[PDB]
Amino acid sequence: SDKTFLENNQYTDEGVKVYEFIFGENYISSGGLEATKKILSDIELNENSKVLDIGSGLGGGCMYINEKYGAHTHGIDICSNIVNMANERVSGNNKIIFEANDILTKEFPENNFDLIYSRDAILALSLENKNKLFQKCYKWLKPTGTLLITDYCATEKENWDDEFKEYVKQRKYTLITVEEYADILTACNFKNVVSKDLSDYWNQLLEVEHKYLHENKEEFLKLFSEKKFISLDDGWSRKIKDSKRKMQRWGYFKATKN
Numbered sequence: 001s002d003k004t005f006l007e008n009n010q011y012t013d014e015g016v017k018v019y020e021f022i023f024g025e026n027y028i029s030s031g032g033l034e035a036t037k038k039i040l041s042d043i044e045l046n047e048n049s050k051v052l053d054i055g056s057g058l059g060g061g062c063m064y065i066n067e068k069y070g071a072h073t074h075g076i077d078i079c080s081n082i083v084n085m086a087n088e089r090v091s092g093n094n095k096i097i098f099e100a101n102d103i104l105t106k107e108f109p110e111n112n113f114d115l116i117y118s119r120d121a122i123l124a125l126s127l128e129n130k131n132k133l134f135q136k137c138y139k140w141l142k143p144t145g146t147l148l149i150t151d152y153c154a155t156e157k158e159n160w161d162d163e164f165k166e167y168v169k170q171r172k173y174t175l176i177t178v179e180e181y182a183d184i185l186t187a188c189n190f191k192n193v194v195s196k197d198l199s200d201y202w203n204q205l206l207e208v209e210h211k212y213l214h215e216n217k218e219e220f221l222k223l224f225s226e227k228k229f230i231s232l233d234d235g236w237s238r239k240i241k242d243s244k245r246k247m248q249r250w251g252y253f254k255a256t257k258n
């Protein structure tokens with residue numbers, strides 16, 4: 001299954017901790033806390049709001065949203081191990097819930113959420129399933145609700161080089177263009193669809209992370225291994241190179257139900 005693939009490879013316990021080291025405490029999403037602050041900078045919610053976080057990971061996003069706004073946050077992630085980790089980092093807070101489930105089968109009421117939020121998680125879904133997911137999101141949003149997404153995107157497949165092809169294949173990602181992604185949202189009837197190619201900003205975030213990794217190599221080696229360091233270092237190097245030339249892209253999407 002997809003769950004087994006993710007838990008046994010990219011998102012083993014150790015894989016998750018390695019990612020957390022570079023992204024920052026409670027994050028496996030690009031730019032950790034700082035990108036979260038920026039992405040939510042024009043979003044308004046309050047203590048009565050209901051938020052869904054698709055691919056909630058280590059829970060930092062939900063923690064931040066609940067801290068900033070006092071909103072109810074419900075995170076869903078397919079990896080049981082990551083959800084277990086997230087649940088270890090929050091206590092005594094009845095407005096944060098993390099649930100291990102498949103978002104493609106999970107049931108939520110129509111007109112339920114003020115915000116549906118997702119950070120670098122939908123890349124794992126096939127194109128067919130991306131469309132199915134956004135149809136569900138449309139239903140699940142309140143009439144007054146907002147959809148807010150970042151995700152890994154790419155140039156057209158015809159332009160990919162050997163190394164990028166191998167990365168996408170090994171990861172089992174389905175990476176589409178920012179423009180194709182926006183078109184899915186439009187096709188799902190979302191209004192006010194705003195898409196931004198934030199590859200340059202993503203490149204900046206990657207550079208901050210890369211510098212951090214290099215400056216904290218000794219600590220990393222104590223926690224992990226040189227082999228894992230090299231893999232991480234090389235992985236960020238490629239993302240930096242590929243975002244600079246727009247082969248690997250970072251898409252931002254915001255839309256509304258009405």
Ligand SMILES: C[N+](C)(C)CCOP(=O)(O)O
Pocket residue numbers: 019028029030120121171235
């Ligand atoms: C996709 N992610 C941002 C959740 C984790 C990192 O994946 P990757 O950049 O190593 O492919």
